[PDB]
Structure formats: C-alpha cells, structure tokens
C-alpha cells in the first residue's frame, strides 16, 4: 500500500496524475478511454526483433500504443 | 450461459464508478455463488466439477 502513497505527494505538482492513473487501472473510465492489455511475444512474434519495429505493427494495424515490456530470463 | 453488457445495479458504496462488465441476463441466487455445498440448481461440491474453461 505504501508503494502508491507516493502518488498523492506527486499530485501537488501534477493535478492530472490521479485521473490518468485510474484510467490505466480502469476505474474512472470515460467514453473516449483505453485499457491495459498483454500481448505475449510467442515464437510467431519473433518475426519482429526490436521494440521499435514492434511499435510499427501495433500502431499501424490496430491503433495500439505500448508502454513497456516484461521479460522472463533464465537465471 | 449467455452474457449481456450493462452497469451493475447494486453498488456497495455511494461514490462508485459505473462500468460495463458482462453482466448475467438473470440475476443469480445467493446459493449458487457458494461452491462448497451444491444447492438444488447445479449440485457441484468442488470447483473442478464445474469444468471451468480458461
């Protein structure tokens, strides 16, 4: 719970910060809004190698924008 | 069973955010929510007996 306590302290400088956080979470969903999804890069998706070229296919075909990536290395 | 998109009728608190959530067509009874004791509707004791896809 203490990890997102920082959210409220950041909200002083940034008024938007609370509203934009809840739109990502999918609580305060307005009509023109988005949501977080998870596209797993399988053996078929290795066709694309870089994150820059992944940005092309997602943006051009289905109008999606990526925030980041979640890796699972063997170690 | 089919699903219908709609805002959930009973919000447990006042200042709550309404959203479309794939609601059930029929409003289910309180007995069918429980797994442990299979009531006169779908007598299943454990969760594996339901046969959950995904």
């Amino acid at each position: 719970i203490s990890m997102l306590d920082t959210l409220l302290y950041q909200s002083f400088v940034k008024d938007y910060m609370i509203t934009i956080t809840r739109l990502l979470l999918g609580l305060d969903t307005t009509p023109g809004s988005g949501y977080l999804c998870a596209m797993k890069i399988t053996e078929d998706d290795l066709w694309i190698r870089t994150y820059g070229r992944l940005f092309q296919k997602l943006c051009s075909s289905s109008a999606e924008i990526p925030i980041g990536i979640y890796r699972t290395e063997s170690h | 069973v089919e699903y219908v998109k709609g805002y959930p009728p009973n919000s447990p608190y006042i200042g709550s955010s309404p959203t479309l959530c794939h609601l059930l067509p029929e409003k289910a009874p309180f007995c069918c929510l429980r797994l442990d004791k299979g009531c006169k509707h779908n007598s299943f004791e454990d969760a594996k007996a339901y046969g959950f896809k995904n």
């Binding site: 307005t30 009509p31 | 805002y7 006042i14």
Partner: peptide, 19 residues
C-alpha cells in the same frame, strides 16, 4: 445502450447519482 448510455453516466452530477 452503447452510445447514449456511456455519455449519460459521465455527465451525471453528484446530485443525480444520489437520486
């Protein structure tokens, strides 16, 4: 249902929610 239902809940004020 889709178009009319979404915009109605967004513009809905606090007094309209409580009613």
């Amino acid at each position: 249902w889709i178009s009319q239902q979404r915009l109605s809940l967004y513009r809905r004020s606090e007094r309209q929610e409580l009613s």
